[PDB]
Amino acid sequence: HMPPIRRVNASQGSDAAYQILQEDGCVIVEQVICPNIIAKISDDVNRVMDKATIGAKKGEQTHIINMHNRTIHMGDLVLTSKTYRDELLNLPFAHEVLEKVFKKDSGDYWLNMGNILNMLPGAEAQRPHRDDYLYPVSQHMDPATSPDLMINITFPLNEFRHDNGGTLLLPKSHTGPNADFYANAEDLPAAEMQVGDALIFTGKCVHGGGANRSDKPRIGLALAAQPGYLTPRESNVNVPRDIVETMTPLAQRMIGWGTVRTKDTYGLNMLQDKDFHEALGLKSK
Amino acid sequence: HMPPIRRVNASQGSDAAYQILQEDGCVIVEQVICPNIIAKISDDVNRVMDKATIGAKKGEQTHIINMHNRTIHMGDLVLTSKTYRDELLNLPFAHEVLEKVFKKDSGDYWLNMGNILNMLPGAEAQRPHRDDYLYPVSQHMDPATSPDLMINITFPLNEFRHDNGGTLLLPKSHTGPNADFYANAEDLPAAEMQVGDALIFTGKCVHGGGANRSDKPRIGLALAAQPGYLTPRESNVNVPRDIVETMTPLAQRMIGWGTVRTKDTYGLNMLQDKDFHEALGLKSK
Numbered sequence A, B: 001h002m003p004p005i006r007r008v009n010a011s012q013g014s015d016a017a018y019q020i021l022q023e024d025g026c027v028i029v030e031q032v033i034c035p036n037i038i039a040k041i042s043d044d045v046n047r048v049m050d051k052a053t054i055g056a057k058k059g060e061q062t063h064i065i066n067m068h069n070r071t072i073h074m075g076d077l078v079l080t081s082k083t084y085r086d087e088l089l090n091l092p093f094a095h096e097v098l099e100k101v102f103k104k105d106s107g108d109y110w111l112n113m114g115n116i117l118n119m120l121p122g123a124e125a126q127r128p129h130r131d132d133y134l135y136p137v138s139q140h141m142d143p144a145t146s147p148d149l150m151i152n153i154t155f156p157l158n159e160f161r162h163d164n165g166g167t168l169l170l171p172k173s174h175t176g177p178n179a180d181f182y183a184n185a186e187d188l189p190a191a192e193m194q195v196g197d198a199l200i201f202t203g204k205c206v207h208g209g210g211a212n213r214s215d216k217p218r219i220g221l222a223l224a225a226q227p228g229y230l231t232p233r234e235s236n237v238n239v240p241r242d243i244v245e246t247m248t249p250l251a252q253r254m255i256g257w258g259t260v261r262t263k264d265t266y267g268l269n270m271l272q273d274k275d276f277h278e279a280l281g282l283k284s285k
């Protein structure tokens, strides 16, 4: 018996989605965002897609997730899309869920990164994995009781199905012990969904990209958030201060332009023994 | 039943110090740095003491270590002391020890912060604590088998004695379970050191600032390093790039101006899916 991927409409409230996410480790939330927003973001991203890296980045092994050369992962979305800085990073449903996940166990949260997941025609499935493997401390904690280190929110930019490689997930796989093998990709259900929908799964949910057996690319956008005490994979210190001061305080903290406090009230990422904003006089929308 | 704080001369090698720190959680290293280096750094620090905060920062609860107001902690040392930037951040003994601590279990390391510690006359002792309590994940890991999350190196800028509040340590206390009480500060040995020595202890070593019963301020310079995947308490994004470029690549990585790889080779603090330096074209020394 393989349990299916469960879905809620966003009009049912982020409590329903959060209860499915803590019982299964994954949930598809339908009609969570206006599809026109996503169309603008796909516009912006397609302009600059010819400048992205195919395969692994420099000096990173590829056998934990089966990182290969018919996928494109592209970052730097903050500079690429204003609609991303303005609409997506402030979506209140997403922050309702992320606050339910992170607030008591860890405190404030920010992005690990925002990432374009391009599964090219011909791309094979990845090895099912846990994303919290990125952080070494996660192997020294019991998954049944340890706090969540990562939450992934994936917005399909075109439609996700099984045949074009929509994300494969293993529901209810998020409490068991860490293992070097979990499942074969061919045994997992795919997250099927449309522009406007989002898939949400935790750093402990077993998942991976599927095989794109179609003749068009399958592209999603993944907002990955984590506790503020974990170092983001992507820094944003090179974003113009004048761009950053048109963003909201919450979104400025998301891209690392703000102090993050632990659930114990201690600040990380401070400037000159003060608040990040206070020390810079950083304005915001 | 109380073990003593063990010490070596830096001329006995980094490997001997490392052995003691592994058996005890703390080691005093004698004559590790020219006293003139520290003297210059202390003139630099004293010129700017009028801009420091006494006691807690805004919002940070105090009862876990007993932070009171006969105590001045002062960060922001990259812009205060040039000798700090050039000399202290490049001291080879320190990096040999931090390499032995961090490299297999975690990967690259960088500063939590460099912090001037001032126990003023009349300062009472702190409650003995473990420093890694700053990071919530430390409470979900078995101390006898889990990676080190922090190494503290403290240079006295004037003589540490018991009488003036020299750091109190519980040697061999670095493998026992986490507890909400470890010992009373009256029961602990003090670290007694000259300018030129250094105390090195880990984030699982039970310690605390002692009681300064003397007439003068007791001042040390703490250098707390942690794995690259933990968010530094102190950012350095407002150091002018011209200053940063006169530092070695190593010192640059220490103050957050570089990419940090985990032991599984994955990079963190990347810029544009590249190395921090490659994407900035950041020069160095």
Ligand SMILES: CC1=C2O[C@@]3(C)CC[C@H]4C(C)(C)C(=O)CC[C@]4(C)[C@H]3C[C@]2(C)C2=C(C(=O)OC2)C1=O
Pocket (backbone or CB within 6 Å): A056, A060, A061, A062, A063, A064, A065, A066, A067, A112, A113, A114, A115, A130, A131, A132, A133, A134, A152, A222, A224, A233, B266, B267
């Ligand atoms: C564990 C592992 C990694 O960790 C994760 C999963 C964690 C975060 C994740 C998020 C959710 C942000 C995303 O959007 C897609 C992929 C990734 C960047 C990813 C990339 C990376 C470094 C990597 C690996 C490899 O093979 O090449 C690349 C790898 O094994």
Ligand SMILES: CC1=C2O[C@@]3(C)CC[C@H]4C(C)(C)C(=O)CC[C@]4(C)[C@H]3C[C@]2(C)C2=C(C(=O)OC2)C1=O
Pocket (backbone or CB within 6 Å): A266, A267, B056, B057, B060, B061, B062, B063, B064, B065, B066, B067, B112, B113, B114, B115, B130, B131, B132, B133, B134, B152, B222, B223, B224
């Ligand atoms: C756990 C705890 C904290 O964690 C530590 C110990 C960890 C790192 C440490 C280093 C070693 C860098 C240092 O140089 C001196 C003290 C401190 C900044 C310290 C400060 C802080 C946030 C805090 C506490 C409190 O009460 O106010 C402040 C507190 O209880």
Ligand SMILES: O=C(O)CCC(=O)C(=O)O
Pocket (backbone or CB within 6 Å): A065, A117, A118, A119, A126, A131, A165, A166, A167, A168, A207, A208, A209, A210
């Ligand atoms: O492309 C996907 O659907 C999943 C991407 C992923 O899981 C990864 O590479 O970490």
Ligand SMILES: O=C(O)CCC(=O)C(=O)O
Pocket (backbone or CB within 6 Å): B065, B117, B118, B119, B131, B165, B166, B167, B168, B207, B208, B209, B210
């Ligand atoms: O002041 C000292 O000697 C110790 C300081 C300390 O342990 C702390 O505040 O974390």
Ligand SMILES: [Fe+3]
Pocket (backbone or CB within 6 Å): A129, A130, A131, A207, A208
């Ligand atoms: Fe993944």
Ligand SMILES: [Fe+3]
Pocket (backbone or CB within 6 Å): B065, B129, B130, B131, B207, B208
């Ligand atoms: Fe301490």
